[PDB]
Design a protein around this ligand. Structure first.
Ligand SMILES: CS(=O)(=O)Nc1ccc(-c2cncc(/C=C3\SC(=N)NC3=O)c2)cc1
Ligand SMILES: CS(=O)(=O)Nc1ccc(-c2cncc(/C=C3\SC(=N)NC3=O)c2)cc1
Lengths: 316, 312
């Protein structure tokens, strides 16, 4: 039995709300197709308990789910069963990753990112086009896989969150992480960041530290082909300031019934194995992140995309 | 899959709310014992859907459950499993009885009565003593068995309901029914009521029509001892104007074997005496207990108890 308990009341409201949201959708027929109204829909719940369940849950909170029918259909197109999703988000509390905060589900399958109200407005502005793009690629994309979007209110605090699939593996640990833009201005981790023992390194760190990505020509072509189409989609929406998140798993260093270095490509959908000539056995996890910044909110989206694709193409 | 659809949006909210209430309590530990705060507690939820689930549910509604921990414990003490209760109130809509509105669950196990805010206030006034009484009698009582109490809202309408166990059988038909007070004044079904095909007859119809109830001595002793303890409980609470609801099933005018019933489901049933001129089953319980104090509560109770022993 689950109680949704947490020291962080926002996590309790999130778990309660995802549990509630998924159960509610079990009482709503699955439509033949989404319609325009589903992209402006929401469900809001306001809870006020008095002297009830008062050690597991906050007594007064609100939970709002945006476009529930759309995100349910996106989960299906991404191969995610609603009961599994519900269990991953509620069986045990999500864990913080240390404004641009994220949590990971306890089973490391999903990311919960705190976003702004402007980000929520931009997601609504692109949701029809994004959903149609996901339909056309059959869910195979390097874009983030958006699975749910909520507003939480508890204790005088109001936050928005979006749930995505983890770019990294739910099982294989990542020992080096980069956030790449192709901009060449202030793209280097701080000495504070580099003191954590999993820093997020940036463009000039990837160059200066001699980072290589050893993937064979077949996989590189497939990857860069996918990247081009995904970025061209973002540029058409006038989006910019997105990154390539690159995570590297070291097979021989995690050592000290899947065999070493193996991963389920239907769960870890962004993994690519290294080529046979790599100096260490590695697995790479690469995807586009932070896509919600609109142009008119210097380089324009067209120039940004060409600089991004050029840089990623040069580093392989 | 259940959708809670109804032509009556208040029934959709009731079904939705009972579904919600029971599922929520599955995420709340069962306590070792109830505490005072549980008798003042409530859970409230307000739902505002926009362009979502608009074919099954009202877009705007609210659902409030009074003292959820208490009614959960009462359901357990009355032998009612929460999932069964949830299923009985939601798998198909409750049906109206066709003022003092009643609906019956689709499987005829439970009754949903509309009550006033004054009734809700009286229920809170007595709930502690009621629960303690149900503990002391191990759930064996002729009083209504209260299973849940809610407030329902749909955008311009607010109602209160209480859920009880059906006094009548969930399978066996009732061919005659009475509501008895021990009149001392005149209680008589109207000619309008008396044109329906199941009227609620009253004291003078029972007397005037020669109704006799034939139960054996042991069953009568058990019933009247229970009735005395229950009525003295009501009198102590200063309650009055309650009735004995009497339903009579006719065994070979209506047709588990005939005349045969489960006393663990139809907990108010009593078999007639084997020598009765015809085979009947009786369903008898005290109802309408929420009126707080010429007649005073002690006089009402003695007049009531004298009348019922009086007709057996
Ligand atoms: C809503 S959005 O599309 O606009 N933005 C977005 C940003 C990050 C992720 C994401 C996805 N997968 C894993 C992580 C974990 C990280 S990221 C980092 N620097 N260190 C970590 O551990 C983060 C997904 C979407
Ligand atoms: C909330 S309360 O305790 O104060 N009042 C109360 C009143 C009636 C019932 C009840 C219980 N079981 C069956 C019936 C059906 C009836 S009653 C009638 N006259 N004709 C019918 O079909 C009604 C339970 C409680």
């Amino acid at each position: 039995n689950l109680y949704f308990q947490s020291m962080d009341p926002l996590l309790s409201v999130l778990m309660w709300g995802v549990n509630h949201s998924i159960n509610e959708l079990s009482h709503v027929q699955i439509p033949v197709m989404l319609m325009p109204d589903d992209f402006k829909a929401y469900s809001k719940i306001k809870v006020d308990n008095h002297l009830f369940n008062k050690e597991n849950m906050p007594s007064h909170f609100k939970f709002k789910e945006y476009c529930p029918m759309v995100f349910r259909n996106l989960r299906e197109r991404f191969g995610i069963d609603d009961q599994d999703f519900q269990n991953s988000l509620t069986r045990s509390a999500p864990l913080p990753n240390d404004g641009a905060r994220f949590h990971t589900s306890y089973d490391k399958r999903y990311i919960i990112k705190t976003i702004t109200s402007e980000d929520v407005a931009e997601m609504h502005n692109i949701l029809k086009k994004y959903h149609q793009y996901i339909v056309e690629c059959h869910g195979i994309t390097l874009l983030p896989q958006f699975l749910g979007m909520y507003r939480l209110n508890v204790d005088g605090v109001e936050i928005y969150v979006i749930v995505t699939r983890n770019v990294f593996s739910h099982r294989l640990s990542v020992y080096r992480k980069y956030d790449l833009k192709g901009s060449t201005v202030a793209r280097e981790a701080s000495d504070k960041e580099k003191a954590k023992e999993l820093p997020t390194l940036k463009d000039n760190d990837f160059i200066n530290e001699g980072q290589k990505i050893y993937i064979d020509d077949n996989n590189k072509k497939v990857f860069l082909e996918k990247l081009k189409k995904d970025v061209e989609f973002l540029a058409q929406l006038k989006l910019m300031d997105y990154s390539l998140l690159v995570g590297i798993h070291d097979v021989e260093r995690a050592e000290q019934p899947l065999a070493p270095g193996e991963f389920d490509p239907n769960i870890d959908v962004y993994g690519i194995k290294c080529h046979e000539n790599s100096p260490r056995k590695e697995v790479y996890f690469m995807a586009i992140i932070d896509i919600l910044t609109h142009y008119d909110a210097t380089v324009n989206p067209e120039q940004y995309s060409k600089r991004f694709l050029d840089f990623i193409g040069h580093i392989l």
